[model samples]
Target: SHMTIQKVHGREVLDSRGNPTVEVEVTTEKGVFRSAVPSGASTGVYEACELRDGDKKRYVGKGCLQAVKNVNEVIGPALIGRDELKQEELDTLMLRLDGTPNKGKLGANAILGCSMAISKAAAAAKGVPLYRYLASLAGTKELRLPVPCFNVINGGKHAGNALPFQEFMIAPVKATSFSEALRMGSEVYHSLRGIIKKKYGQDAVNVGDEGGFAPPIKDINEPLPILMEAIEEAGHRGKFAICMDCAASETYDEKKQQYNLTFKSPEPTWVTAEQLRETYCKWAHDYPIVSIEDPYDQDDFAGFAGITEALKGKTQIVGDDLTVTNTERIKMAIEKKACNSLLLKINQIGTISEAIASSKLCMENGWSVMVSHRSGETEDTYIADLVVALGSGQIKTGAPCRGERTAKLNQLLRIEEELGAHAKFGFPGWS
Candidate 1:
C-alpha cells in the first residue's frame, strides 16, 4: 500500500555551509520522499543533540557519518513496513527507540531526517500538498501566508563584526500579498547591498552563514540606522517593519549575571538585565522594531518577563534559545510571562509531531509563533510550508539572497501562486 513505508535510507550530505548533515529518503508504493535536517551555529544546551562524528580527519570533526549510520542501521530498519500516514505513532516509535528525553541516543539529526521524510511520504499518500497536509494535521481549515522577515544584515555569532545582535531583519508586514511582500523584501535587500558596497567596500557585501551581509561596523547601535537607510532607499520605509534576534545567550555572562553588550568587540561593555531592558525599550521607541527575540539569557526568565511586560502592547518579545521548541520550557515561560512569542525550529525537538505540538501550545497560550531557519541551512524548504501550515504569520528564513536562503522564499512564492484568490497575506492588524 502507498501508505506503508517500504524502505528508508540515510546518507551524509553537505549543507549550505558545507557542513556534513543527515539526509533521509523514505519509500512507499507511490515513490520516494526525501528530507534533510538543518543545523544551528549557536545552539542552546536544552535543544536536542545533533550528533556528529568526532573523527578529526573527517569534515574537521564535524562529520555526520555517525548520525547517518544510526539512521541506516537503527532507525531505517525499524521504520520499514510502518504506516507513514500514522505520523504520531511513527514519531513516537522513534522517540521510544531513542529512549532519551533530548534524543541523545539516536541523534536528533537522524530522527528528524527520518521523521520529515516520513511526513513527506504520508502527504503524498494522502495526495495533497505538504502545506495542506500539515494544515490538516494542525486541525485548521484556513491557511494564511506568513510575513517574511528577511535578515539583511548579520552580526554577533553569525558574522565577524562588532555589532552585538545576531540578526537584523526586515518584515514586509504591510504588503497586501505574499508576492508583493517578497518583492519588497528583495528590493530592500538589494538596497542594503548597494549601500554596503558604496559606504564600506565591495567585500562588505559578502554575506554570513545566514546569507545576511556582514559589514565591518564597530558600533553596537549602528545596524538599525543602516537598515532604515536601506528601507528608505528602496522606497518602502512605511511598508516594512524591523525585527531583531539578539541571541542573547551568546553574550550572557553566567558567572557575572550580566550581558556584555560589546561582546564581539575588543573590550566588553557589561550591563545588568535591568539596564539591558531599558536599552531595548529605548530602541523599540527609536526604531520601527516590531519584534525582538532572545533579549535576555535563556536562563533569565525574570529579565524576560520584565521586558515583556514593559513592552506588552508595543512590541513582540520572542523566545528562541529560551524555549528551544520544548513544550515544557514553553509552559514554564508562559507561567512566568517571559515572552509573547515562540521561535519554532523542528530540529530542536527532533520530531514533526512534537514541533507542531509546541506551536499549538504557544498559540493556545496566546503567543505568536515564528517558524525559523537555522544559520547552517540547506536547500530544503520544509519551514516554508510549515509557516503556512501552522498559520503562524511570521517566518525568518534569511535574506533574499543565496540559493540556500532563497529556496524557502521561492517555495512560498509558488505556494501563494497556487492559493490564488483564496490567498490572504499580512498578519492580522497589519492587514
Candidate 2:
C-alpha cells in the first residue's frame, strides 16, 4: 500500500548524550513510523543547526521545545495528506517552508526528525526492511555489511583527558562476518579493560560517550602502545587495525597560526602542524594504524592534501570536520584532493537525501565512505540500515558497548541473519 502522510507529530526526548532532542512520528495510510535524531559533541563548523531554547534554566537551555513545537504546530499541519513515498517533494516542501541557510526557522532537529520518520513510513508502506527501502532510494544495486571501526578508547571532547584526539578505534579487518567482527572487538575491549586495570587502576577503565575507555593518561602516545598490547593479548595481533579521530581543529592556535597541544608528560609541551602531521605519518609507518581522521586543521585544505599525497596508498586519510557531509564542501575537497575517505554523518547535513548525495559524490570520486554515528547518539538504529543500504563498506559506531552504539552493531547482525546465505561482508579497512 502506498501511504499518504496522514499526520506528523513530535515530542521532546533525551539522547544518549543526556541532552534534550526531538523524536518525530509519522502516521501514514498503512501505519505509523517513528525515528529519533542524535547530536554531536565535536560538531563541525558548517553543520546544520540543532535549534534549542535559550532560557538557560533547564538543561542549560539545551531543551529542544521550540523544535518540537515546530513539528507539532507547523510542519505537521503542512505535510498532512501528502504522499509519504514522494520524499523529495515532501522534503522540498519542508525546505521551502523553512527558507533559511541553516534550517533556523523550522529547526534542523525538527526537519530531520520528520524526514527520518517519513523514510521509515515509506518503508513500512512498501512492506520491506528499512535497508531495502533506503537502498532503493539511494539507487544502490548491491548491498554489503560494512566493516566496523570499533572505538576502543576516548579522549579530547568525548572524555576527561589531556589527549587532543577524540577517538582511538580498533578495526577487526580480518573478520569474515559482522558477528565475528563484534566478537573480536568485544574480546579486545575486555582485554583492554584488564590491561588498563593492571597498569592504571580499575578506575581508568571508565567509559565515555561512545562507550570507549577514557583513561587518566595525558600524552597521546601512551594510549597507542597499550591498545596494541590489548590486541596481542586478545590473540589478534596482525588481524586488527587502528584509526584515530584527531578532531585537530579543537587544538589549533589561530592566533599563533600553528597546531598547539600541551602534553602533560606531566608538564606542558607543544608541537606545530608539520610536527603533528609528521607524527601521523610516523604512526602510519610504525603501527597498524590504517586510517587517520581530521589529522589537520579543519579549514587547512592544503595540509589535508599534503597528508593525502604523502600516504595515499599507504593509509586512509579521512575527512570528518573537513567534509562535514556537505556536497559543496565535498566538491571543494575533491578539487583540493584533500582526503581518501569520507565520514558520512546524516545529521551533519540534516537530511537523508543530502547525505546520500554526498556519499555518491565521494564514491564517484573513488573515495571510501564510512557511515557514522555522533558522540551523542540514540538507540535508534537507523544508520545500521543506511550502511547496508548504501553498501558503504565501512562504519563507525563507537566501541561494541552502550545501547546507542551496540544497537547499530546488533541491527547489522540481525540484517545478516535475515539475509542468511546470500549475505556478504565488506573487505577489510582501507583495502
Candidate 3:
C-alpha cells in the first residue's frame, strides 16, 4: 500500500527533432516508470525554461547534458525515498527546490520527465490504469474519450512552405470510437501524401517536423481543397473537418508590431492585429474550420475576444500562445472572454498537477481544453492518458503519421480497446 520512490535517474536522449533531450526514470515499490519530455519549435515567450548545454560541438547547441545531470544529481537526491503516491506534494517540492518561476534552475525538461515517470510509477503501485489513476488524482467522475485533431498538412515554422499557418489538421469528430477517428485521420493522411506528391512533385512530399507534407504552397487555402479532397477520398467528408493553427505569434514581428500573413513567399505584406482578425473570420466562413488556434498575437487579448464574439457558436476560438497553460493568464482570458477553448500542453507549465489544474480551470469557465503534443516530441505517450483522464474530449497530436505523433494515437486506440464497454468516445465539440 505504501508507494515510495525507490530511485530516480536519467540520461541524455533524442526527441522527434533529432535534438538531445532527457528521459527521466522513477523506480517505485511497484514498477519502474520512465518518460520523456517534449519540446516546441514555435515557443512562447512565457514558456518554462528548457536548459541546454549550449555546446556547439554537440548536436549544434541542443545538447541535454545539464538536464541529465540535473536529474541524476540534483533531482534524484531530492526525490529518492520520497512518497510517490503524493504527486502534488512531490511536484510542489520539486518546484520549491528549483525556486524558479519558469523552471530555469533544474530545467523543465528534466523536471517534467521525472514528474511523468513518478506519476506512472504511482499508478503501477496502485494496480490501476494510468488514466484511471490520473482521474482519481483529480477526483473526477466523468470519463470520456477524445477526438484527435490530426495535423495532416504542415507549414510555417514546421515546414519550409510559404504558407503562414503552422498547421492544418483533420478532426474526425463524428466517429463512433477513438479507433474509427484514428482510422479516418490515417487514411486521409496517407491520401494527402499522394495528393501532394501528384500536385507539387516528389520533393514536396518531404515531411516537416511533425510528419506533415512540406509542400511549398504560397496561399494557406491552397491546401484546403486538397485536404477536403483527401477527406472525400477517405470516404469521410462531413465526418471530418478542418482545424487550423495560425501560430500568429511566431510570424508576428514584435519590433514592427505586425503579423506577417502574406500569401506569397519571400515577400513582406504584414497585416495589423485587426486585419489579421478579419482574415481569420474570412477563413472560418470560407472553409469548414470548426476550430482555429492562436489566430492573433499572444498579447492581443482584445483581438481574441473580438474573433470569439464574431465567430461565436460557429467555431472554437482556441488559445495556445495566449494562454500558455498558465492560470493567471487563463483567469484574465476568462474575464475578457478571450477565447472559447484552451490548447493544453503539460510541459508548458512544467508539471502534471499544474496541467490538470489548468484543465479543470478551463472546464470551470466552460472552455473546452485540447491537450496537445509539441512539434519537438518523443515516443512517449503520457499525454494520451492525460487527455482521457481529464475527459477533455479533444486532442492535438500532429498527424497520424510520424512515430512520435502516432505513438499517442496508437496508445489511445489501445486504451479505448482496453476500456471495452466502459469506454465512451463522446461526441465532437462543434460540427
Candidate 4:
C-alpha cells in the first residue's frame, strides 16, 4: 500500500488549438503518471482562472509558461515526498498556496494539471484502473458508461459560421454497448460529411475547434435538419438524439439584458428570454433535441428557471455557464430551479475532489451530470474514466474526428471491453 510521490514535474504543451497549456508528471516508485490541462474558448465568467504568461511575443500572449513555473518551482517542490493517496489534502494544499477565491495566483491550469496527475498516480499506486480508483473516491457501487454526446456541428465562437449558438451534438442513447454507440457516431459523422459536401461544398466539411463541421450556413435551424438527414441516411434515426450547447453567455448583452440570436452577424438581433425559451421549446418539438445547455445568460437565473420549468419533463436543461462546475453556483441553480443538469468540467473547478464534489451535489439534488471536455484539449483521456467512475451517464467530448476527441471515445471502448459483461450502457434519464 505504498503511495509516495517521488517527484513532480511540469512543462508547457500545445493543445488542439495550438495554444500552450500546462502538463504535469507525477513520478512514484511504480511509474510516472501524466496529465494535461485543457482550455475552453467560450469560458464561463464564474469559472476558475487559467494562468497565461501574457508575453505577446510568445504564442501571441497565449503562453502558459507562468503556469508551468508555478507547477515546477512551487507545486512540485511542495508536493515532493507527500502521500499521493491524500488527494483532497493535496488539492487543499494547492488551493491554500494560491490563496485566491478563483485560483488567480497559482492558476487553475497549474493546479488542475498537478491535481489530475496526482490522482492518476494514486490510481496506479493502488493497481487499479483510473475509473475504479475514482469510483472508490466517490463511494460508487454501480458503474455505468455514459451516453456519448458527440458535438458534430460547431458554431458561435467555436467556428466562423453564422450560426449563433455554439455546439450541436449527436447523442446515441439507445446503443446497447459503448462500441456500438461509437460506430453509430462515426457513421453519422461520415454521412454528414458527404451531405455537407454535396450541399455546401467541400469547404463546408471543414471541422472546428471541437472537430465539428463549421458550415457557413447562417440560419440557426440549418444544422438540425442536416444532422437529421445524416442520421437517417446512416440508418440510425430513432436510436439517435440531438443535444446543443447554446453558450448563450457569449452572445448575451449585459448592458441591454437581451439574448442576441444573431451575435455573429454584422447586425445584432436581440430577443428576450421568453422568446429564446420559445425557440428552444420549438426545437425540442420539431427535432429530437434531448438536452439544451446554457440556454440563457450566465447570471440570468430567472431566465434559466423559466426555461427549466417550461421544458421540465421533456428536455434536460443543462447548466454550463450557469453553474461553472462550482458548488455554490450549482447550489444556487438548484435552489432556484434553474436547470436539471450540471456540465462537469475539471478545469472549471480546478481540482478533482471539487469537480467530483460538484457532481455529487447535482446527483443528490436529482439533477443529471454531463462530464465535459474543453474546446482546447489534448490526447489525454482522463474524462473517459472519470465519467464511468462518477456514473454521470453523459459525456460531451466532441465529434469522433480529431485525435484528441477520438482518444476519449477509444478509451471508453477499451474500458467497456475490459468490464465485459459488467459494463452497462444507456442514456442517463433522457428518452
Candidate 5:
C-alpha cells in the first residue's frame, strides 16, 4: 500500500531586489513535504535557453514557484487517493501525467516535491530519519557525501574563452566500488587543499569547505596546471577528478551545423566549432579531466558526438545541454553517440519521475550519471537524496551558499554521519 497525494499549497519568497528569490510551500495528505529555493540544483536553466545568443541574461528562467504550482495543479490531482507506499507505481503515475516533451515543462521541480513527500512519508512510516532510509535503500550501512564545488567563474558570455571553465572542478572520485568511493572522496578533499596551497601559495588558500566565498581566481590559465601538478605531488594518482559546467554562452547554427561560442557584454563575439574543439583538446591534454559537460551547443549532436569521439578515453564528453534530461533528446544523443556521460537535472524535464527515468535510461546504456544543482536554488534536499538512492557518482551544488545549497550540503553531511562504519567508501566517479 502507498500513501496518496492529498493537497498542495505554495507562496513566493522575495529577495531584496524585489524578485522572487524562491517559492515555499507544502504538499500534505499522506505525508508532509516542503520545498523552497533550489540555488544550485542544475545547469539546465542556461541550457534551456539554448536558442538565445549574445547576452541573453534577461530570460528570467523557470523557478521553484512554477514547479510548486505544477505539483499542486497537475501532479497532485492526478495522484490523489492513490496508494502511497508503492513507490514504483507512484513514479509511473507521475510520468504518465507529467512526462513528455511539453506538458511537464517544470517536471523536475514537481518530481522533487513528490520525492520529498515520498521520503518524508517513508521515513515517518519506518520511524527513522530520512538519512537512515536513504542508507537502507543504498544497501550500505553508512552514507558518504561528496564535497560540492560551484562553477561560477565562466558564467555570462565570456564563459568559453576562460580556461578555468574547462577543468575547474573540485570533486574527488577514488574508485568504482562503494568502499573506495568514501576513501577517494576524502582523499580528493585533501588533495584539493594541497593544490590550493601550492597554486595560491599556502597563505592564499584560506577558505575551508564551508566558509565565506573567496575572491575569484583571476588567472584561470595557471590554476589548472598548478592544480594538476599539486595532485601528483601529493602522492595520489587518479584519486581526484575534474567536472565542467560548459553552460555554453553560444548556440549551434543549424544552417552551418557547427558549435558556436557567444559572449554577452562589451559587444558579442562568436567562436566556431573548430575553435572550441582546439581549446577543449588542449585542456583535456593538460588536465586529467574526468567529466566535460556541455562542450558543444545544445543543438549540435554531430559536434557533441565529434567531441566524444575525440576525447573518448581521455575524458568523458557529457551531454547536459544536448539531452536536457528529456527522453527524446537523450535518445537522439544516444543514437548519435553524442556523449559518454549524462548530467541529470530534474528541473530540466520538470518532474521527479521523468528525471528518474532519464537516469535509468542512461544507466541502462552505460552512460555515467551526475545529478546536479541549478543557479537559482532552494532548500529542497530531494536532489541530494535522489543521487544517493540512484547511486549517482557526483553532484554539483555551487561553492556552498545559504538557502537551497546549504540544505543539500546539510542533508549529505547528516547521511555521512549516520552511515558511520560504512562511511569510508571512496568517491564514485562519473561512469
Candidate 6:
C-alpha cells in the first residue's frame, strides 16, 4: 500500500518571542499525519513538520512558523500524488529539491515531519505502538524516560537575568526509581526558585543574576551560602540530587568579563575565576549535583577541564554548548577530559544517525549522555523514543505543555504503562 499526500493545512503556535510556529496537517491516502514546523531556541534547533500516513511527529524545531509555511507551500506541492509507501523516495525528492542546501530552509521541520509520516505508516502497517516498531528494530522492549526540571532559566528566582542564562540547575544526589527521580528533580528546582524569590523577590532574579540592576557581587564569595541553604531545604524535603544546566554564557564571567564564550568584550561587570571556583566548590560540597552543564564558555575547553578535574569525584560536569554533540567537538572534549557527561541534542548535529553515533561514542568512552529538547519545540516525541531506544534514560523537555513537550511526556507515560516493572530498568542512575 503506497501512501500519498492528499493535502496539507498549516496552523500556528507562539513562542516567548511572539514568533509563530507553523504546524501542518497532512492528509495522506493512509491517514492524516500532522507535524509542527521546526523551531529554534537558545540552545538547540528543530526541524519543520513531516506527515506520515495519519500520524505526525516532529523531531527537530526551527522556532519560526513562517519558515514552516514556506516549506509546506514550496516543498509540499511536490509531495502530493507521490507513493506513500516509498519513504526513501520521498526523502530523495526532498533532497533533490534545491539540494541538501535547502535542508535548513526545509530544516528539521520538514524532515522531522517526513520521519513522523514514515514512522506512522510503518506502525499502522504493523499495527503497533510507534515504540514497539522502534523496539523491534533496536532489539529492545524496555525504555527509560527522564523527568526534567522546570523553568531552568528566566522563570523563577532567576527571572530577572541577574545571572547568566544558564547557571541555575538542580543537582541530584542519588539516582532512584524514575518517578522518584523526576519528582525529586522538580522539587529541587522549585526549592531553588523559592530561595531566590525570598532573597531577591520573584521578579528580581534570573538564573545567576546576570543582568540584574543590583550591584554585581564584588566578592564572588556570597552566592554559596544562599545556594547551599536552598539545597539543604530542598534536600530535606526529598529534593536533592539532580543535574544543573548552567548554560554558562560570557555575561556571567566574573573573570574574563565578557558575554558568551567569545573573548571579544567591552569587559563585563567582572567577578573572578576564583569566585566562580569557590561557588562551584561550595555547590559540590553541599549538594549532590550529578551533572553540571555549560559551566564555562563553549570554547573554554581548558576551563571545563579544570572544573571537571576539580569536581571529578564530586559531580559529573556535563557539556552542552561545549560539545553540541558534534563528533569532532565531542572527540575534542574527550581528548581534553573536559567533562564526563554529554548533553545530547539530536538536531544539533542535524540527523538521527549522527545523534545516535555521538551517544554511542560517549557511552563507549564511559561518558554519561542526556537527550534534551530545545526551548523552542514542537509536537514530536521521537527524542523520547530515542531515549528509550538508545538507553539514555535522561531527557530534558522542560515543563510540559499540550504540544511538543506533552507529546513526549504522553509517550513516556505510555511506556511506563506498557513496560510495567521492566520499563524504568534501562536508563542509567535509575534503579
| Best lDDT among the predictions, by candidate number | 4
The residue-level lDDT of candidate 6 at 332 comes to 95
For 1-431, candidate 5 gives per-residue lDDT tens digits of 23444555545554222235334333444356665434332244333221111222422642345555665677667666655555557766666665554443544445555654665565566677765565454453334454354432233332223222322564545553433443443344456566666555765444422221222353334456644554476565666666665655244455765443332225434567778788778888877666788876677778888889998877887787678777878899899999977787765665455666787788789787777765555556766776666665467764443455567766766666565655444334443
Sliding window of 10 residues with minimal summed lDDT for model 1: 422-431
lDDT against true structure, model 6:
0.56
The deviation in Å at residue 143 for candidate 2 is: 0.5
1-431 per-residue lDDT for model 3 (tens digits):
25678889899888987888889889876777989989998888878888899889999899999999999999899988887878999899889979989999999988999889988998887889999999998777877789989887898888877888899988888888888888888888888888888998999998888888889787766888898889988788888878999898877888998877663366897779887777777888887888999988898889899999999877888989999998988998999999989999888888888888888899888999899999999999998999889887899988877899989989998889888866788445553
Better by TM-score, candidate 2 or 1: 1
Ranking of models by lDDT: 4, 1, 2, 3, 6, 5
For model 1, the stretches where C-alpha displacement exceeds 4 angstroms are 1-3
Error of 5 at 283 (Å): 0.6
Which parts of model 2 have CA positions greater than 4 angstroms off?
263-268, 428-431
- Please, what are the lDDT tens digits per residue for candidate 4 over residues 249-309? 9989988989787887889898888888888989999998889999999999998999888
Residue 305 of model 1 has an lDDT of 95
Per-residue accuracy of model 1 over 333-372 as CA lDDT, tens digit each: 9999999999999999999999999999999989999999
For each of the candidates, give the backbone clash count.
0, 0, 1, 0, 39, 57
Residue clash pairs of candidate 1: none
lDDT of each: 0.90, 0.87, 0.87, 0.91, 0.56, 0.56
RMSD of 2: 1.7
Worst lDDT 10-window in candidate 2: 260-269
